[PDB]
Design a protein around this ligand. Structure first.
Ligand SMILES: CCCCCCCCCCCCCCCCCC(=O)OC[C@H](COP(=O)([O-])OCC(O)COP(=O)([O-])OC[C@@H](COC(=O)CCCCCCCCCCCCCCCCC)OC(=O)CCCCCCCCCCCCCCCCC)OC(=O)CCCCCCCCCCCCCCCCC
Ligand SMILES: CCCCCCCCCCCCCCCCCC(=O)OC[C@H](COP(=O)([O-])OCC[N+](C)(C)C)OC(=O)CCCCCCCCCCCCCCCCC
Ligand SMILES: CCCCCCCCCCCCCCCCCC(=O)OC[C@H](COP(=O)(O)OCCN)OC(=O)CCCCCCCCCCCCCCCCC
Ligand SMILES: CCCCCCCCCCCCCCCCCC(=O)OC[C@H](COP(=O)(O)OCCN)OC(=O)CCCCCCCCCCCCCCCCC
Ligand SMILES: CCCCCCCCCCCCCCCCCC(=O)OC[C@H](COP(=O)(O)OCCN)OC(=O)CCCCCCCCCCCCCCCCC
Ligand SMILES: CCCCCCCCCCCCCCCCCC(=O)OC[C@H](COP(=O)(O)OCCN)OC(=O)CCCCCCCCCCCCCCCCC
Ligand SMILES: CCCCCCCCCCCCCCCCCC(=O)OC[C@H](COP(=O)(O)OCCN)OC(=O)CCCCCCCCCCCCCCCCC
Ligand SMILES: CCCCCCCCCCCCCC(=O)SCCNC(=O)CCNC(=O)[C@@H](O)C(C)(C)COP(=O)(O)O
Lengths: 178, 126, 53, 76, 88, 170, 55, 99, 221, 62, 459
């Protein structure tokens, strides 16, 4: 979530993703902790015994066969953490994740209910206003004239500067707003 | 012991054979797709985090999709025998079918009522 | 100056009064069967001269 | 404690509209409802009677509720 | 009432608790800045198992890309704090 | 009670006397006595006050009666005056017949609820009355259409009488 | 109760067993939600757009 | 290019008039328009008109038809008459064709 | 933040459920039926930021609307043939062929009680909060089709085909839902399929000429 | 790659693959998070059928 | 009727003589008073019809339409007085004059007692809505929409004029009561079939019938909010009222001549509900929903049952109210985000809670939630159609299912879900538009409370 995906997944990343998914489905089958630990050590032994492959064409073939085996032997209802997608509590508080710009449309009475918070909000707004021009200049400088471009973003590289496009990251709503 | 993909149950992106037999052309195509995605993302994020923005962000993709779904269809329509037959069937066949259904039902009802064989027990408000 | 600056507020009530008057004119125009209907043919009371106005 | 600010939209305008709507509706209806209750308690509810011989009733006299009789007498 | 909040020290203590319960890591050489492959001598499967242990402790999963980005207990602690909005 | 048992018949209630075998007190009797003393007494007091206020301000209203205008059978065709009078009389009688059917149906529903488990036997006369009035209503008003009128009712009656007369030939 | 207790003790027993179509049918709700909720909305909405509106 | 005016941007109307009611830019006409809409719309139409419609009596002869039906039911039940005659019109006054 | 709205929605559902239970005419029965359905929609889609919750509420609306089609067929037939939606004139309709209205009532009961063919909206409807799941889909709303067939049991006793198809449908759905419940992992899903199995048992009890046993099982369940 | 020129009004609109939004990566911050789509990328002709509230084309375990 | 017509006429000098800072206030207040005056037509204590004059009369069918028109005029002013703030004063007064002229001509059309005057006021109402759509519409396609609307209506209405002149030559007066009393049965020849088609096709065009409904979606999309309101809430009902008025002299050949139009209505309501399921434009969705509801009204009027006529009248009034309300809510979102895309604004329940409540209530009215008059009309239409033929229940049930589906789909995709946080220009709410939603919803509640007002001619 906090990192952007690359153009393609390398072979090592595909193998590690398969290993983690296989362990999760193995725990979904095993339920009990001791049984899960036994069969997870067996799965780790399988991955270790196929680890040192040098041809890499046979390694891709083994990865394909292992993926076929996983799709044949996966749990129909694997365990999902509640906050994870497909879980029971996933996107539950999106109805409460109100974006911060409605305080701009708040009435002066409602602002008068919270004086100090709105003063600090104005300070954040002024900081954003200066940093926007600074970071637009930085992003224009940092952009390659031609070639390969990814979704990664530069940090602040000088004193008294903020990272570009920091507003929607820093001022995002909390995961438990209430 | 094999997963058979369907239009409604597609092939996994980890089970398709095209993933394991990769080519440098496919790799550079994926890199170019990531480059296009990153350029669009950078433009959208600049427009999104600009504080002087006082309006919503327009989506030309959404505008194109709505225009293609609404106003481009008749400019891009050409009469072919296949769509002529499809339009004739989809515009008349249900009408003729329900015509024969209702005509047969009401003819049977009128015949039963005229020969007295249909009994109206308490039907007073029709 | 209120009559000068608020004279526009009498146009719609004037139209309403004029419409009521025109409706009364149509009512007294259509009196060919006043107390002549076979449903409501009744003898006049001594203190009245018409059944309805 | 450690209480945090909760971001909410402007409920002020919805609350103000509801308050104004209820204000005007109450401002006329409460006199109307009070008048309905007073009329029904004290006067009216005309009971059915046989027409006396040789008597021609007024048209509003064919109606039951006193408010209905008043409107039919004054405007119809 | 229920669900007490997380703190930075609590997250650090629980992460170091799990890493000390790991057998391949000797607790005397474990630090909050100990790298998994540099000065701990682990591998990618070990890192995946560590991340799965952290997910099992804190009751929510880390996505795979951030998970393979995480390579030290301080990085894991910072990720947990950033995800759970633990500011102090 | 503004209603009368001639048009809303009701059999007299036959309630049995209480015969409590048990020595336990009846909470229903306790609650009904308390409910009377708490609720029924102030309600009947304020109702008596309202009734005496109405007696102080008593008014009367009458039920309008229409004389019988000549029927459409003696109305010449194209004479819209007498045709209008007969059509209005027919619509009035149509509304009266609608309310007659409502009265009969309400009477049948009351019979069914009163009898309960014995409605298949004790509502024989109510069901017979409902069937007869339904048959008469179907003979006079059914299949007229949305633009029902005295002319259409007369045409339907003439057609039905012609069919009956032709059946009576043989 | 006794049969389910024996089956739960067998799940406690340390052995992986190969999955069966009966257990897959039971866990995936008899395939009714997947099959019907994928074929009937698809046919209905595709018929709507591809025939009524457009054609 | 042709000398066309640029696109006007809709400003936040609540920024200069936080008590904006939707009717007019200046506050006085806005609040008087709100008061006129509420008073002439809710107060004297949705209340007085509702009361007038509620106290329209005998609407399309509902209760008159009910009372006349009750009277006819009483008469025909105490006189042994049928509740409804099968023929609306008397057969004596109808001249059927001969053939 | 919206606990008052949650409580108000539960109260509105209770009002509509008691309207549906105590209604004497089929139109008021329909008012309670649809109010119960709409409050079910809102309470399933309580967390309206959840796409799966919105989808579950929508599919509950869909299956209940198919049940509504059956209900409207029965209501229209009774209006045309007995001139009322009143249960007393339905009792007088007990003595003729009631195949079309009884089939419509069976379709309505299937849609509301989540029998086979129209079942999965209930375990989908477990997406709402747990008090909603309990009150709505465990005790009160889902027994409304069983209550409807209990209501029209004097018509149902004289139609053998309706009794046989109700018995077969209830047996099929209780077997299928118990089988589905055998291997579930979500505890709410397990007890929801348990609820559907018990509703199938009530439909079996209605397939026999035992409506009062079905109502007693409604209360106990 | 556009739709074939069958005279059905598609025009030059692209033939995106017939996969619903459920197959999209749920851990990525899409610009349209409900739609799981980024800003500026082409929109499928049947997005209103392939949204997450509607028809699913995700792979099944069987 | 003159006491309603005359002050509505005097609204125009009030509009042109009021101060620019007082025009909206004065015209809105006096149009509300006009509606309150129009409420006196409900005083019907007899079976007779309120024949006010030799050219104006009131009916149990005409009265709800007149009251709805007089009620919709101030609501149209409130709806339209926001997108005209950056507008010239004389153009604002001209727009108000167009709305007032529409209200006057529609009241006269519904109160007309003579079919030639009905046709003259029919075309008189055809003019200013065309002016409104063409002049104050937003996109480029408003000109094509106005042409489609105008010439569909004109090609419909010309054979209606020929048929009316033929009936006038045959009978003598073309007066409604005289025709109703001295109706003669047609002998069912080809000339009479063509006469039937001539006098029915204009109303079928303006209903609109399926296949000839193509003017309606683009006209409603391109029209301004007041034009959409007056169209979807009065003019289709004007077509239905014309059908009910003219159908009395078409016996008996309407019995077999109604067959293609009933099939067109039923299958077209299914097709248009499917289009609502797959439609990317909110105003187009509302327009096609209007097409389906008016198809139900067409089928009821064709089958000519008293239950069908009552359900037709109730559905006319209910659909007018709920379609105007839906158009006003969609216009509030359009004035917010400057787009009509269905899927663009999603999480509006978060920012606009009370407006989401109005959305929910409007959609529940749209899908005929009991005991509303929407369900009353739809249910009695279903009863009459099932009496006409038992197999119509399949088409009715499919239409009801798809109706609930598109209504709840609209609610979910416009209110529920995650909020589109990029829409920084979401002003909270206008008391004017919240008042507009309330003034739509409350008469629906009151007519639900007392449905005897809108039963119509038959009961
Ligand atoms: C006798 C001996 C000859 C027999 C013969 O040739 O038979 C084949 C011949 C059709 O020719 P073909 O083999 O399709 O030719 C294709 C070209 O070679 C190759 O096609 P192309 O793409 O080169 O041509 C372009 C396009 C040329 O463009 C067009 O054809 C334009 C479209 C013409 C009308 C299409 C009507 C059908 C669609 C209706 C949709 C629903 C409407 C709403 C409901 O051609 C077509 O679309 C082909 C079909 C043409 C059909 C012509 C029908 C004429 C009679 C129509 C009668 C009235 C119809 C209903 C009207 C309702 C009004 C309210 O006739 C038949 O198949 C029998 C039916 C004949 C009509 C009845
Ligand atoms: C919106 C739809 C528009 C098209 C359909 C319009 C209705 C179609 C059916 C009616 C025929 C046309 C209108 C006739 C009006 C008068 C009817 C009448 O009085 O009938 C009795 C009369 C007969 O007169 P009569 O009733 O006195 O007959 C005398 C009978 N005896 C002797 C026994 C007493 O019918 C006609 O005169 C009809 C002649 C019509 C000739 C012209 C037709 C032109 C084309 C019409 C459509 C044009 C627009 C559409 C173009 C295409 C668009 C895609
Ligand atoms: C009154 C209106 C009458 C319209 C008549 C139109 C007849 C058209 C006949 C024809 O050529 O049909 C072609 C159609 C499909 O054939 P083709 O054109 O090759 O389409 C490519 C992919 N199917 O062929 C078919 O669909 C075959 C249908 C067989 C039944
Ligand atoms: C305690 C609780 C009590 C609850 C009460 C509930 C009801 C409250 C309202 C009561 C009055 C309802 C309306 C009555 C009149 C209806 C219209 C009407 O009939 O007008 C005609 C009448 C003229 O009388 P006419 O027809 O000649 O015959 C009289 C006797 N035959 O015209 C008149 O008589 C005119 C005077 C009566 C109408 C007053 C209207 C006031 C303004 C609203 C409408 C706007 C009119 C235009 C603008 C006027 C501005 C002042
Ligand atoms: C006629 C054509 C109209 C065309 C559109 C007009 C628009 C403008 C309207 C302006 C004002 C006019 C109002 C017209 C309706 C008047 C309602 C009314 O008061 O009706 C009278 C009724 C009592 O009449 P009654 O004779 O007892 O009823 C029949 C019984 N024999 O009175 C009552 O029962 C009391 C009513 C007021 C008290 C409050 C009622 C609250 C009801 C809450 C319902 C909640 C559930 C709603 C569910 C909706 C679902 C979508
Ligand atoms: C022994 C005898 C046995 C007899 C057996 C008889 C079986 C009869 C079966 C009758 C019912 C079949 C049709 C049921 C359709 C249900 C569609 C539905 O609700 O789909 C839900 C689905 C999304 O839900 P899902 O994917 O399950 O879960 C979300 C998890 N992410 O998708 C959606 O939410 C899509 C959104 C809706 C799209 C529009 C749908 C319109 C449907 C119109 C149907 C018209 C015809 C209906 C005919 C009914 C006949 C009974
Ligand atoms: C759009 C769908 C059109 C087709 C619908 C299905 C066929 C309907 C056929 C029909 O209208 O049949 C009724 C009638 C039957 O004939 P009959 O009653 O004997 O009339 C004697 C005529 N001298 O038929 C006739 O009287 C013949 C003339 C019927 C014309 C109906 C309208 C045609 C379309 C106009 C647009
Ligand atoms: C539930 C059922 C699950 C069944 C899954 C079956 C998987 C078991 C079969 C296997 O393990 S086949 C594994 C094939 N993978 C390889 O050969 C990868 C070898 N290539 C490499 O570069 C390896 O050294 C590594 C391990 C990927 C490198 O990682 P280091 O630890 O950084």
């Amino acid at each position: 979530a906090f990192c952007a995906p690359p153009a393609y997944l390398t072979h090592q990343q595909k193998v590690l993703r398969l290993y983690k998914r296989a362990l999760r489905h193995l725990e979904s089958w095993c339920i009990h902790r001791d049984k899960y630990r036994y069969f997870a050590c067996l799965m780790r032994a399988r991955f270790e015994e196929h680890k040192n492959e040098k041809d890499m064409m046979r390694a891709t073939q083994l990865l394909r066969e292992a993926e076929e085996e996983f799709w044949q032997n996966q749990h129909p209802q694997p365990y999902i953490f509640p906050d994870s997608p497909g879980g029971t509590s996933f996107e539950r508080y999106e109805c409460y994740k109100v974006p911060e710009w409605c305080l701009d449309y708040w009435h002066p009475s409602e602002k008068a209910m919270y004086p100090d918070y709105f003063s600090k909000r104005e300070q954040w707004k002024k900081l954003r206003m200066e940093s926007w021009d600074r970071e637009v200049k930085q992003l224009q400088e940092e952009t390659s004239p031609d070639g390969i471009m990814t979704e990664a973003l530069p940090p602040a590289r000088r004193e008294g500067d903020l990272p570009p496009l920091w507003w929607h990251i820093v001022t995002r709503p909390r995961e438990r707003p209430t | 012991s094999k997963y058979k993909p369907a239009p409604l149950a597609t092939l996994p992106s980890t089970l398709d054979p095209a993933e394991y037999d990769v080519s440098p052309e496919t790799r550079r195509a994926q890199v170019e797709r990531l480059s296009i995605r990153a350029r669009l993302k950078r433009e959208y994020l600049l427009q999104y985090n600009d504080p002087k923005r006082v309006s919503h962000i327009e989506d030309p993709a959404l505008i194109r999709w709505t225009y293609a779904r609404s106003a481009n269809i008749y400019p891009n329509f050409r009469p072919t025998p296949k769509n002529s037959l499809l339009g004739a069937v989809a515009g008349f066949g249900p009408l003729i079918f329900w015509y024969y259904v209702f005509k047969t039902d009401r003819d049977r009802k009128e015949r039963l009522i005229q020969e007295g064989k249909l009994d109206r027990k308490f039907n007073i408000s029709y | 100056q209120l009559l000068r600056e608020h004279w526009v507020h009498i146009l719609v009530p004037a139209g309403f009064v004029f419409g009521c008057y025109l409706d009364r004119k149509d009512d007294e125009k259509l009196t060919a069967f006043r107390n002549k209907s076979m449903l409501f043919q009744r003898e006049l009371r001594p203190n009245e001269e018409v059944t309805w106005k | 404690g450690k209480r945090l600010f909760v971001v909410k939209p402007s409920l002020y305008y919805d609350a103000r509209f509801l308050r104004l709507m209820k204000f005007y509706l109450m401002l006329t209806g409460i006199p109307v409802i009070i008048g309905i209750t007073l009329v029904n308690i004290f006067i009216g509810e005309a009971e059915l009677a046989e027409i006396p011989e040789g008597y021609i009733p007024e048209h509003w006299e064919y109606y039951k509720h006193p408010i209905s009789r008043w409107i039919a007498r004054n405007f119809y | 009432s229920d669900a007490p909040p997380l703190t930075l020290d609590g997250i650090k203590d629980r992460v170091l608790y799990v890493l000390k319960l790991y057998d391949k890591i000797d607790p005397e050489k474990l630090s909050v800045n100990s790298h998994f492959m540099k000065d701990l001598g682990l591998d990618s499967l070990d890192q995946v198992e560590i991340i799965m242990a952290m997910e099992d402790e804190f009751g929510f999963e880390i996505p795979d890309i951030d998970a393979e980005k995480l390579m030290c207990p301080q990085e894991i602690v910072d990720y947990i704090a950033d995800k759970k909005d633990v500011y102090e | 009670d503004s209603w009368d048992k001639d048009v809303y018949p009701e059999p007299p209630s036959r309630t049995p006397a209480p015969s409590p075998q048990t020595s336990l007190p009846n909470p229903i009797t306790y609650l009904t006595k308390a409910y009377d003393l708490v609720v029924d007494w102030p309600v009947t007091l304020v109702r008596e006050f309202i009734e005496r206020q109405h007696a102080k301000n008593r008014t009367y209203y009458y039920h309008r009666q229409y004389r019988r205008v000549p029927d459409i059978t003696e109305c010449k065709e194209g004479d819209v005056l007498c045709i209008y009078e007969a059509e209005m009389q027919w619509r009035r009688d149509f509304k009266v017949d609608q309310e007659i059917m409502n009265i009969i149906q309400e009477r049948l529903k009351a019979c069914q609820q009163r009898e309960g488990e014995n409605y298949q036997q004790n509502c024989a006369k109510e069901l017979e009355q409902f069937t007869k009035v339904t048959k008469a209503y179907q003979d006079r008003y059914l299949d007229l259409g949305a633009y029902y009128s005295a002319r259409k009712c007369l045409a339907k009656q003439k057609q039905r009488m012609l069919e009956e007369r032709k059946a009576a030939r043989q | 109760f006794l049969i389910a207790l024996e089956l739960n003790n067998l799940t406690m027993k340390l052995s992986m067993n190969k999955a069966n179509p009966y257990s897959s049918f039971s866990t995936l709700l008899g395939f009714f939600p997947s099959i019907i909720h994928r074929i009937t909305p698809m046919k209905s909405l595709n018929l709507s757009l591809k025939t009524s509106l457009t054609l | 290019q042709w000398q066309e005016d640029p696109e006007p941007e809709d400003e936040n109307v609540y920024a200069k008039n936080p008590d904006f009611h939707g009717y007019d830019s200046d506050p006085v006409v806005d609040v008087w328009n709100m008061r006129a809409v509420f008073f002439f719309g809710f107060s004297i139409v949705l209340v007085f008109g509702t009361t007038f419609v509620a106290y329209v009596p005998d609407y399309r002869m509902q209760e008159w038809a009910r009372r006349e039906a009750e009277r006819l039911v009483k008469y025909r039940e105490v006189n042994g008459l049928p509740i409804m005659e099968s023929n609306y019109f008397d057969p004596s006054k109808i001249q059927l064709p001969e053939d | 933040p919206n606990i008052n709205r949650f409580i108000k929605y539960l109260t509105l559902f209770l009002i509509t459920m008691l309207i549906l239970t105590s209604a004497n005419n089929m139109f008021q029965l329909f008012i309670g039926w649809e109010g119960v359905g709409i409050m079910s929609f809102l309470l399933i889609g309580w967390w309206y930021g959840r796409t799966d919750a919105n989808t579950a509420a929508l599919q509950a609306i869909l299956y209940n609307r198919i049940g509504d089609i059956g209900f409207i067929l029965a209501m229209v037939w009774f209006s045309l043939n007995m001139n009322s939606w009143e249960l007393q004139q339905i009792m007088f309709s007990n003595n003729n062929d009631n195949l079309i209205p009884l089939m419509g009532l069976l379709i309505a009961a299937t849609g509301k009680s989540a029998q086979f063919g129209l079942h999965p909206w209930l375990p989908s409807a477990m997406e709402g909060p747990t008090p909603v799941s309990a009150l709505l889909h465990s005790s009160t709303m889902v027994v409304a089709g069983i209550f409807l067939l209990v209501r029209f049991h004097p018509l149902t006793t004289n139609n053998n085909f309706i009794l046989t198809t109700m018995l077969c449908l209830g047996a099929l759905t209780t077997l299928f839902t118990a089988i589905c419940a055998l291997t579930q992992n979500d505890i709410k899903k397990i007890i929801a399929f348990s609820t559907s199995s018990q509703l199938g048992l009530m439909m079996v009890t209605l397939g026999m000429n035992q409506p009062h046993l079905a109502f007693l099982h409604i209360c106990t369940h | 790659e556009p739709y074939p020129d069958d005279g059905m009004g598609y025009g030059d609109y692209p033939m995106l693959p017939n996969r619903s939004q459920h197959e999209r990566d749920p851990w990525y911050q899409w610009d349209h998070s409900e739609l799981r789509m980024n800003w500026g990328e082409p929109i499928h002709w049947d997005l209103d059928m392939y949204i997450r509230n509607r028809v699913d084309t995700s792979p099944t375990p069987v | 009727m003159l006491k309603i017509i005359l002050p509505s006429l005097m609204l125009l000098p009030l509009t042109w003589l009021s101060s620019p800072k007082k025009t909206w206030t004065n015209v809105t207040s006096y149009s509300f008073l006009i509606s309150l005056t129009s409420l006196t037509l409900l005083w019907q204590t007899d079976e007779n019809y309120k024949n006010f004059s030799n050219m104006f009369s009131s009916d149990p069918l005409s009265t709800p339409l007149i009251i709805l028109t007089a009620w919709l005029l101030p609501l149209m002013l409130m709806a339209s007085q926001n997108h005209l703030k950056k507008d010239n004063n004389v153009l604002q007064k001209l727009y108000i004059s167009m709305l007032i002229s529409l209200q006057i001509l529609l009241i006269m059309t519904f109160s007309a007692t003579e079919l030639i005057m009905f046709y003259i006021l029919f075309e008189a109402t055809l003019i200013p809505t065309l002016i409104i759509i063409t002049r104050w519409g937003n996109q480029t396609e408003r000109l094509n929409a106005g042409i489609y609307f105008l010439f569909y209506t004109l090609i419909g209405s010309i054979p209606l004029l020929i048929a009316l002149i033929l009936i006038q030559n045959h009978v003598g007066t073309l007066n409604l009561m005289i025709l109703s009393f001295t109706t003669h049965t047609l002998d069912a020849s080809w000339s009479n079939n063509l006469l039937w088609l001539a006098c029915m096709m204009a109303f079928l065009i303006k209903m609109p019938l399926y296949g000839v409904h193509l003017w309606l979606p683009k006209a409603h999309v391109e029209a301004p909010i007041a034009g959409s309101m007056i169209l979807a809430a009065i003019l289709l009902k004007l077509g239905s009222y014309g059908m009910i008025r003219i159908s009395i002299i078409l016996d008996p050949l309407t019995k077999y001549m109604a067959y293609p139009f009933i099939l067109l209505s039923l299958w077209g309501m299914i097709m248009t509900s499917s289009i609502c399921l797959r439609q990317t434009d909110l105003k187009s969705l509302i327009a096609y929903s209007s097409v389906s509801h008016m198809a139900l009204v067409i089928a009821s009027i064709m089958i000519q049952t008293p239950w069908s006529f009552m359900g037709a009248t109730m559905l006319m009034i209910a659909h007018g109210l709920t379609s105007s309300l839906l158009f006003c809510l969609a216009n509030s979102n359009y004035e917010r985000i400057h787009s009509r895309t269905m899927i663009m604004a999603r999480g509006l329940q978060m920012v606009f809670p009370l407006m989401a409540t109005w959305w929910l209530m409007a959609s529940l009215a749209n899908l005929a939630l009991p005991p509303s008059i929407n369900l009353m009309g739809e249910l009695f239409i279903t009863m009459s159609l099932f009496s006409w033929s038992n197999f119509t229940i399949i088409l009715m049930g499919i239409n009801i299912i798809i109706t609930g589906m598109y209504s709840m789909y609209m609610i979910i995709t416009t209110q529920r879900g995650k909020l589109t946080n990029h829409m920084i220009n979401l002003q909270p709410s206008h008391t004017r538009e919240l008042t507009l939603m309330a003034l739509h919803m409350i008469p629906l509640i009151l007519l639900t409370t007392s449905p005897k007002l809108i039963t119509g001619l038959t009961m």
